[PDB]
Amino acid sequence: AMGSMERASLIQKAKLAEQAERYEDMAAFMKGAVEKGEELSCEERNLLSVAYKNVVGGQRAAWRVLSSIEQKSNEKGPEVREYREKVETELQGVCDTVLGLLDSHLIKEAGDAESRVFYLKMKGDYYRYLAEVATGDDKKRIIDSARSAYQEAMDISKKEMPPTNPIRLGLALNFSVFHYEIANSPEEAISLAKTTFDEAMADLHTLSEDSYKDSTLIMQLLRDNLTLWT
């Protein structure tokens, strides 16, 4: 639907939509920008991620509210299940849209470590969101798709980025959450968070004041999870 709008205008409108807290619009503008077929800059990748994370974050929060109501009712009519299913189908549609952009063709064109890790982290995240609602015969395959994307991103990040790099840290944070919440592997989650935190700490001395702030912010999230989990 964005085919007639200039790439630069889509990016500009995505930034306006962010300021206006219109995240559905923001995601639609960024989808249009991706579909222009050019690679995305660092700033543009961040806009894409912010837009879809906010859209799917609202859907996930709503799904959790409805799932809790549904579980209490099963301890009435079909309405709670029907509405939870409606929200779930919408959420799955957004995840499928993001995964489709990554597969056509953001990942295959991403050769630099920063871009490839970013997109593989996204792929892991959106399969993780699908896994949160999955219950059928493809749930194990959904979980393995998330794991495989995160693992490839981890392998690249360890070879190509310093331990304080914000995308490397955020990837490790999210893969640890995957281990804890999705894969039923709390020890792996804790080990990954601890090792990531400690290796970043030992590399902070190389950073400028601004980079130090970026890295320590994400390290604090790792610490918050370790405090919750231990």
Binding site: V50, D125, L173, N174, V177, Y180, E181, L221, N225, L228
Partner: peptide, 7 residues
């Protein structure tokens, strides 16, 4: 629920 990456 633990924290995944957030702004």
């Amino acid at each position: 629920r633990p924290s995944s990456w957030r702004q």
